[PDB]
Amino acid sequence: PKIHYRKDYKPSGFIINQVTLNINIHDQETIVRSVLDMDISKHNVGEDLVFDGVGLKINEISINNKKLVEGEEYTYDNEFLTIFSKFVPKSKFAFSSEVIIHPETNYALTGLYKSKNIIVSQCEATGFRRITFFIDRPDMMAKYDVTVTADKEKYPVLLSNGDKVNEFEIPGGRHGARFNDPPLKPCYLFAVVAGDLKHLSATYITKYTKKKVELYVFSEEKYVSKLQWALECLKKSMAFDEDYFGLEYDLSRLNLVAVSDFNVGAMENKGLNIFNANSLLASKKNSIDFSYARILTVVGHEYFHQYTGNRVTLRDWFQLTLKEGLTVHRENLFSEEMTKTVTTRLSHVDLLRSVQFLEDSSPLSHPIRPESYVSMENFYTTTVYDKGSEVMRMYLTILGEEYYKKGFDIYIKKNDGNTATCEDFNYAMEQAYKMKKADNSANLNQYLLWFSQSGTPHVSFKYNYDAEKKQYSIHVNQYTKPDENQKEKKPLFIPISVGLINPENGKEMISQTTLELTKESDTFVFNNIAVKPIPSLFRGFSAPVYIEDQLTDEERILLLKYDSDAFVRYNSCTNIYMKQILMNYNEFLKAKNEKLESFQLTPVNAQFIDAIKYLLEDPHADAGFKSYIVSLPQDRYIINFVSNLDTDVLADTKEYIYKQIGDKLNDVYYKMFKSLEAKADDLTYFNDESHVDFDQMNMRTLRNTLLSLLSKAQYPNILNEIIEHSKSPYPSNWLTSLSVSAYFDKYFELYDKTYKLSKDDELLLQEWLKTVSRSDRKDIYEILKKLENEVLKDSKNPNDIRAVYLPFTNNLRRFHDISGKGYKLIAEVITKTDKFNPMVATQLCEPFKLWNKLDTKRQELMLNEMNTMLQEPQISNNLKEYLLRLTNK
Ligand SMILES: CC(C)C[C@H](NC(=O)[C@@H](O)[C@H](N)Cc1ccccc1)C(=O)O
Ligand SMILES: [Mg+2]
Ligand SMILES: [Mg+2]
Ligand SMILES: [Mg+2]
Ligand SMILES: [Mg+2]
Ligand SMILES: [Zn+2]
């Protein structure tokens, strides 16, 4: 297993200037003819010409139209084609090959593959080498001339990058299309699509150049009607990049294509973006609300790559966060502007502090720019994406909008036609920083540590107020725990967005202030502070850190009620919950350990419960925000604060806290559930495909959250409400009715009802599967067996497999059954999947990421399953690397 190191980057001894491809798709095989117009680079030292080429069947290879002989002139080991240096020309030459590949049986969904009746490619990161020979790395920029031929009846629509310059008939019912893409691109941005695709189309006229852009969105015939929202999202994305960044689309056409079998959400192939159907297709009748936000995000994200990824590309894969982190940041800005709801930012924070913080405190912890990799397919992590995005967002927080935009424009203008590194971006931002600070001595050298240092910083506070002096002091400390990547951690440049709230009237006491913490600790003093304030810290979640506010619950309640910042209010609530959780957890644990016949639990703070009620009864307050306040922190957030987490004890802890709050608030919950119905379930625009109301969907979120709380509580006659909810036209509602009926004898009645409603839409059926998988059923293991036998069967569709198994892994009480049967189940699924799709197999390992954080027995059980998986003779390099790193081998 070859380990690739960041420090080892060297430019290639070769140049590829032109790629000329002929892709001939037949019934049982695809023939790929390729001519590479090549040259020797200034870095050449007379080395062998080595091409990446994985799983290719060689018919012939040639140099300058002279056929090469195997053994004497070249060797091929199914991974690398080595042409011995003595046979390699010293000037410009043509390398040519004809290879056979088999998309029909390509179940790994990388390279060229078949998804139902569509032939499609996926080349990022190292997939192009599965199509034809190449020096398969992003710094190898080339021009592409691509011809695709296929049966006309089966594959009437042929697509690749660039302009379609010819279409022709071929004897035997075949046809071809030629595509020429003159601008240079890395091979990971190559794509081809062939199928019986239907489309919706629109024309977009750019803001400044006034260029007409053809927008096409494609799917199989059955689902073409579900493409309208994606089209709207694309227009919105183009508009936002123009309006916020002054960036226009540079090409004549943009194609988006939905496929059923896809390893991730989507891929930004230049002018030919390819999507998991679940991230492009939606309808109000056949999609849950989440689909709308999801499509907006994914279409936006892949569109924003056109500049940050496509036009400015990566020098090497270690720079991944430069395109992924930056593009997530760009999508976040976009979505915040489109949705106009505080929940957009809140949801991103919620994900980071649960999923990413877990990763960063696990054996898998890495910086956003890792120092090494074995498998690129394992590199696309929440750290690279989500911490990367927070690192990119901090530049905006530090600089402000005006100077951030200046620095971003500097980055684009300077790097537009070329590859780039993280230092290039930091450099552009530093120029803006120099201009903002009004001195050319200012730098961001310390900021680079955000790229190189792994682990989550802990930021803690102490306060002082002198009433006589009207002087307030905030003393701040930062600390990152040593880990496997750095023994010595260094202080980071941490921007702390702060406000000061007057506890007497809830008013702001100071103007917008961002404290720049650049040392291990610092004291920030404020004069003319008339009364002792309550500090509002890390507004907007201004740095990706553990915040230790050292506030009392009284102070936190005041922020929750009266602060201006959504995040600080949300976080204050989070902190109140966390203090309660830790206390009750310890109480339950002590009782368990000591085998106590009786014991006491600390009740939930009554003024906190009053504050929740206050917020819930406020008409001005955001419905999405309300759904967060009535929900305890994510289990994966909680686990970062507990050693040897006993999952049964945590389940008991949550149960107690919810019961405590419900015992006081259930009547309020019910009243709200009923009063929200009219606006939440409004059908006025149900048949308007383009009318999307994020506030209304948040209202449904709140309703469904409250229904869940009331169902768990066995609120009197709530089954009546559940049954009526099942009759709603909105899948978010009727699928909720299924999940919440888990606590009632009518579960299987609704199981059958909702299955019938879901079965005839591929994506809706997958949503139903997720809903069943996540159902709080005592017989969940029996239900999963039913799903396997009756619905899933031997599907190799990643969406199907992920839907059945992943939501179940969030069942705290059942997945972590002390017998280890949950761990055994998922391990079996991972191993089975690894046989045909190593990438998805590694995704299915997610539950195991917290293995060393659990109680000693569950640690042992999880480790056993991981060692068992590692012992499988046929284990992929993908899965092996991941599990070796996770188990600290
Ligand atoms: C972040 C989300 C909006 C979408 C996300 N997609 C991406 O980030 C794409 O731009 C990625 N460039 C696609 C990708 C992901 C993993 C491995 C190879 C290729 C995905 O999950 O597919
Ligand atoms: Mg093969
Ligand atoms: Mg406009
Ligand atoms: Mg988001
Ligand atoms: Mg299917
Ligand atoms: Zn991306």
Task: Please give the full DSSP string across 501-543, using - where no structure is assigned.
Answer: E-TTT--B-S--EEEEE-SSEEEEEES---S--EEEESTT--S
Tokens standing for 762?
A: 């591929």
Q: Ligand 3 centroid to 243 CA: how many Å?
A: 7
> Residue 169's beta-bridge partner residues?
175
* Residue 138 CB-density burial (10 A; 0-12 exposed, 13-18 middle, 19+ buried): buried
Experimental method: X-ray
Residue 547: phi, psi to the nearest 5? Answer: -95, 120
How many C-beta atoms lie closer than 10 Å to residue 859's C-beta?
16
For CA atoms 825, 829, 834, 835, give the dihedral sign: positive
Q: What distance in Å separates the CA atoms of residue 180 and residue 168, rounded to the nearest whole number?
A: 15
CATH assignment of 455-550, given 2.60.40.1840, 3.90.226.30, 3.40.50.970, 3.40.50.2300?
A: 2.60.40.1840
530 is in an annotated binding site: no
268 is in an annotated binding site: yes
Nearest CA to ligand 1 atom 8: 324
Residue 561: phi, psi to the nearest 5? Answer: -80, -40
Q: What distance in Å separates the CA atoms of residue 705 and residue 663, rounded to the nearest whole number?
A: 16
Q: Cα dist. 422→62, 71, 321, 356, 411 in Å?
A: 39, 42, 8, 21, 11
Q: Is the CB of 826 under 6 A from ligand 1?
A: no
Contact indicator for 3, 372 with CB cutoff of 8 Å: yes
Q: What distance in Å separates the CA atoms of residue 428 and residue 409, rounded to the nearest whole number?
A: 8
Contact indicator for 527, 543 with CB cutoff of 8 Å: no
Q: Which helix (H) or strand (E) holds 409?
A: helix 388-415
Q: Ligand 2 centroid to 330 CA: how many Å?
A: 38
Q: Is the CB of 572 under 6 A from ligand 1?
A: no
Q: What distance in Å separates the CA atoms of residue 142 and residue 136, rounded to the nearest whole number?
A: 11
The residue extents of the domains of the chain are: 11-197, 198-283, 284-454, 455-550, 551-889
Contact indicator for 187, 314 with CB cutoff of 8 Å: no
Which residue among 126, 264, 314, 329 is best mutated to probe the pocket of ligand 1, counting the most ligand atoms within 8 A of its Cβ?
264
Q: Which ligand places an atom closest to the C-alpha of 300?
A: 1
Q: Is the CB of 124 under 6 A from ligand 1?
A: yes
Contact indicator for 497, 540 with CB cutoff of 8 Å: yes
Given the CA of residue 385, which atom of ligand 1 is nearest to it? 1
Q: Is the CB of 380 under 6 A from ligand 1?
A: yes
Tokens standing for 625?
A: 């925000």
* Residue 595 CB-density burial (10 A; 0-12 exposed, 13-18 middle, 19+ buried): exposed
Q: Which ligand places an atom closest to the C-alpha of 78?
A: 2
Nearest CA to ligand 1 atom 13: 267
Q: Ligand 2 centroid to 29 CA: how many Å?
A: 10
With CA atoms as reference, report the closest residue to 769 among 795, 740, 792, 798.
792
Overall fold of domain 284-454: Neutral Protease; domain 2 (1.10.390)
Q: Is the CB of 264 under 6 A from ligand 1?
A: yes
Q: Ligand 6 centroid to 228 CA: how many Å?
A: 22
Contact indicator for 196, 151 with CB cutoff of 8 Å: no
Q: Taking each helix axis as running N to C, give the angle between helix 388-415 and helix 422-437, from 0 to 180 degrees, rounded to the nearest 10.
A: 90
Residue 265: phi, psi to the nearest 5? Answer: -85, -50
Q: Taking each helix axis as running N to C, give the angle between helix 780-787 and helix 821-834, from 0 to 180 degrees, rounded to the nearest 10.
A: 20
Q: Ligand 3 centroid to 239 CA: how many Å?
A: 5
- Single-letter amino acid, residue 188: Y
Q: Ligand 1 centroid to 331 CA: how many Å?
A: 12
With CA atoms as reference, report the closest residue to 276 among 287, 288, 263.
263
191 is in an annotated binding site: no
Contact indicator for 192, 259 with CB cutoff of 8 Å: no
Q: Is the CB of 238 under 6 A from ligand 1?
A: no
Tokens standing for 413?
A: 């203008």
Tokens standing for 392?
A: 């990119």
Contact indicator for 865, 830 with CB cutoff of 8 Å: no
> Residue 111's beta-bridge partner residues?
122
Q: What distance in Å separates the CA atoms of residue 307 and residue 90, rounded to the nearest whole number?
A: 36
* Residue 39 CB-density burial (10 A; 0-12 exposed, 13-18 middle, 19+ buried): middle
Contact indicator for 774, 292 with CB cutoff of 8 Å: no
Given the CA of residue 324, which atom of ligand 1 is nearest to it? 8
Q: Is the CB of 700 under 6 A from ligand 1?
A: no
CB crowding 677-688: b at 16 or more within 10 Å, else e:
beebbeeeeeee
Set 220, 302, 762, 846: catalytic member: 302
Given the CA of residue 302, which atom of ligand 1 is nearest to it? 10
Which residue among 267, 279, 375 is best mutated to probe the pocket of ligand 1, counting the most ligand atoms within 8 A of its Cβ?
267
Q: Which ligand places an atom closest to the C-alpha of 132?
A: 2
543 is in an annotated binding site: no
Q: Is the CB of 335 under 6 A from ligand 1?
A: no
- In the residue annotation, 302 being an active-site residue is answered as yes
Tokens standing for 131?
A: 């199509």
Q: Ligand 3 centroid to 416 CA: how many Å?
A: 23
Which residue among 380, 381, 383, 846 is best mutated to probe the pocket of ligand 1, counting the most ligand atoms within 8 A of its Cβ?
380
Query: Where would I find the H helices in 617-646?
Result: 623-629, 635-638
Q: Ligand 1 centroid to 292 CA: how many Å?
A: 18
Domains 284-454 and 551-889 belong to one CATH topology: no
420 is in an annotated binding site: no
* Kind of pairing between the strands at 272-276 and 372-373: unpaired
Given the CA of residue 265, which atom of ligand 1 is nearest to it? 22
Q: What distance in Å separates the CA atoms of residue 74 and residue 365, rounded to the nearest whole number?
A: 41
Q: Cα dist. 65→56, 97, 144, 712 in Å?
A: 20, 10, 20, 73
Q: Which ligand places an atom closest to the C-alpha of 128?
A: 1
Q: Is the CB of 615 under 6 A from ligand 1?
A: no
* Kind of pairing between the strands at 534-537 and 494-501: antiparallel
Overall fold of domain 551-889: Zincin-like fold (1.25.50)
Q: Which CATH class is domain 11-197?
A: mainly beta
Q: What distance in Å separates the CA atoms of residue 147 and residue 453, rounded to the nearest whole number?
A: 46
Given the CA of residue 300, which atom of ligand 1 is nearest to it? 3
Q: Cα dist. 431→399, 408, 550 in Å?
A: 11, 10, 37
Look-up: residue for tokens 């998922």?
826
N-terminal to C-terminal alpha carbon distance within the chain? 14
Q: Is the CB of 301 under 6 A from ligand 1?
A: yes
With CA atoms as reference, report the closest residue to 239 among 229, 249, 230.
249
With CA atoms as reference, report the closest residue to 638 among 684, 582, 569.
582
Contact indicator for 677, 707 with CB cutoff of 8 Å: no
- The set of residues, in sequence order, having a beta carbon less than 8 Å from that of 316 and lying 6+ positions away, is 6, 9, 137, 138, 139, 421
Q: Is the CB of 265 under 6 A from ligand 1?
A: yes
Q: Which CATH class is domain 198-283?
A: alpha beta
Q: Taking each helix axis as running N to C, give the angle between helix 694-712 and helix 290-304, from 0 to 180 degrees, rounded to the nearest 10.
A: 130
Contact indicator for 273, 257 with CB cutoff of 8 Å: yes
DSSP percent split of the chain into helix, strand, coil, nearest 5? 45, 20, 35
Given the CA of residue 266, which atom of ligand 1 is nearest to it? 22
With CA atoms as reference, report the closest residue to 662 among 637, 632, 701.
632
Which residues have beta carbons under 5 A from ligand 2 (an ion)?
A: 55
Q: Cα dist. 592→108, 635, 649, 742, 871 in Å?
A: 47, 20, 8, 28, 36
DSSP 245: I
Contact indicator for 249, 290 with CB cutoff of 8 Å: no
With CA atoms as reference, report the closest residue to 463 among 452, 472, 471.
472
Q: Which helix (H) or strand (E) holds 666?
A: helix 647-680
Given the CA of residue 276, which atom of ligand 1 is nearest to it? 22
Q: Ligand 2 centroid to 83 CA: how many Å?
A: 20
Q: What distance in Å separates the CA atoms of residue 784 and residue 773, rounded to the nearest whole number?
A: 7
499 is in an annotated binding site: no
Given the CA of residue 377, which atom of ligand 1 is nearest to it? 17
DSSP 636: H
Q: Taking each helix axis as running N to C, give the angle between helix 566-594 and helix 647-680, from 0 to 180 degrees, rounded to the nearest 10.
A: 140
With CA atoms as reference, report the closest residue to 54 among 881, 841, 876, 840.
876
124 is in an annotated binding site: yes
Q: Cα dist. 272→116, 292, 305 in Å?
A: 19, 21, 12
Contact indicator for 803, 840 with CB cutoff of 8 Å: no
Which residues have beta carbons under 5 A from ligand 5 (an ion)?
A: 797
Q: Is the CB of 863 under 6 A from ligand 1?
A: no
Q: Is the CB of 289 under 6 A from ligand 1?
A: no
- The set of residues, in sequence order, having a beta carbon less than 8 Å from that of 668 and lying 6+ positions away, is 613, 616, 617
- Report CA dihedral (287, 291, 293, 299) to the nearest 10 degrees: -120
Q: Cα dist. 437→71, 384, 398, 434, 494 in Å?
A: 64, 29, 11, 5, 17
Q: Is the CB of 68 under 6 A from ligand 1?
A: no
* Residue 225 CB-density burial (10 A; 0-12 exposed, 13-18 middle, 19+ buried): middle
With CA atoms as reference, report the closest residue to 369 among 349, 343, 388, 397.
388
Q: Is the CB of 386 under 6 A from ligand 1?
A: no
Nearest CA to ligand 1 atom 11: 267
Q: Ligand 5 centroid to 57 CA: how many Å?
A: 29
Look-up: residue for tokens 């998805």?
840
Given the CA of residue 380, which atom of ligand 1 is nearest to it? 16
Q: What distance in Å separates the CA atoms of residue 43 and residue 11, rounded to the nearest whole number?
A: 7
Nearest CA to ligand 1 atom 18: 124
Q: What angle do CA 433, 438, 441 make, to 5 degrees?
A: 70
Q: What distance in Å separates the CA atoms of residue 826 and residue 815, rounded to the nearest whole number?
A: 9
Nearest CA to ligand 1 atom 21: 265
Tokens standing for 546?
A: 């553990």
Look-up: residue for tokens 């383009």?
690
Cis amide prior to 94 (ω within 30 degrees):
no
Q: Ligand 3 centroid to 212 CA: how many Å?
A: 13
Q: Is the CB of 649 under 6 A from ligand 1?
A: no
